[PDB]
C-alpha cells in the first residue's frame, strides 16, 4: 500500500 | 494496492 | 489493484 | 411529518 | 417534524 | 423539531 486508510467506527450522536 | 481505503462501520445517529 | 475501495457497513440513523 | 429524512448528495469516490 | 435529519454532502475520497 | 440533525460536509481523504 502507498496511501492512507482510516476506519472510523464511531460518528455517533446519541440522545436519551 | 496503490491507493487509500477506509471502512466506516459507524455513521450512526441514534435516538431514544 | 491500483485504486481505492471502502466498505461502509453503517450509514444507520435509528430512532426509538 | 412524524419521522426522519436525510438527503445524501455525496457518496462520491473519485479517482484521477 | 418529530425526528432527526442529516444532509451529508461529502463522503468523498479523492485521489490524484 | 424534537431531535438532532448534523450536516457533515467533509469526510474527505485526499491524496496527491
From Swiss-Prot, chains A, B, C, D, E, F:
UniProt subunit comment: Homooligomer; homooligomerization is induced by Zn(2+). Interacts with FASTK; the interactions leads to its phosphorylation. Interacts (via RRM1 and the C-terminal glutamine-rich (Q) sequence) with SNRPC/U1-C (via N-terminus); thereby facilitating spliceosomal U1 snRNP recruitment to 5' splice sites.
Name of the protein this chain belongs to: Cytotoxic granule associated RNA binding protein TIA1
Tissue/organ expression: Expressed in heart, small intestine, kidney, liver, lung, skeletal muscle, testes, pancreas, and ovary (at protein level).
Locations listed in the record: Nucleus; Cytoplasm; Cytoplasm, Stress granule
Lineage of source species: Eukaryota, Metazoa, Chordata, Craniata, Vertebrata
PTM characteristics: Phosphorylated by FASTK; phosphorylation occurs after FAS ligation in FAS-mediated apoptosis and before DNA fragmentation.
Entry remark concerning the domains of this protein: The RNA recognition motif domains RRM 2 and RRM 3 are necessary and sufficient for binding to uridine-rich target pre-mRNA.
Connected disease: Welander distal myopathy: An autosomal dominant disorder characterized by adult onset of distal muscle weakness predominantly affecting the distal long extensors of the hands, with slow progression to involve all small hand muscles and the lower legs. Skeletal muscle biopsy shows myopathic changes and prominent rimmed vacuoles. Rare homozygous patients showed earlier onset, faster progression, and proximal muscle involvement. Amyotrophic lateral sclerosis 26, with or without frontotemporal dementia: A form of amyotrophic lateral sclerosis, a neurodegenerative disorder affecting upper motor neurons in the brain and lower motor neurons in the brain stem and spinal cord, resulting in fatal paralysis. Sensory abnormalities are absent. The pathologic hallmarks of the disease include pallor of the corticospinal tract due to loss of motor neurons, presence of ubiquitin-positive inclusions within surviving motor neurons, and deposition of pathologic aggregates.
Biological role: RNA-binding protein involved in the regulation of alternative pre-RNA splicing and mRNA translation by binding to uridine-rich (U-rich) RNA sequences. Binds to U-rich sequences immediately downstream from a 5' splice sites in a uridine-rich small nuclear ribonucleoprotein (U snRNP)-dependent fashion, thereby modulating alternative pre-RNA splicing. Preferably binds to the U-rich IAS1 sequence in a U1 snRNP-dependent manner; this binding is optimal if a 5' splice site is adjacent to IAS1.
Amino acid at each position: 500500500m502507498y496511501g492512507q486508510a482510516w476506519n472510523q467506527q464511531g460518528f455517533n450522536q446519541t440522545q436519551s
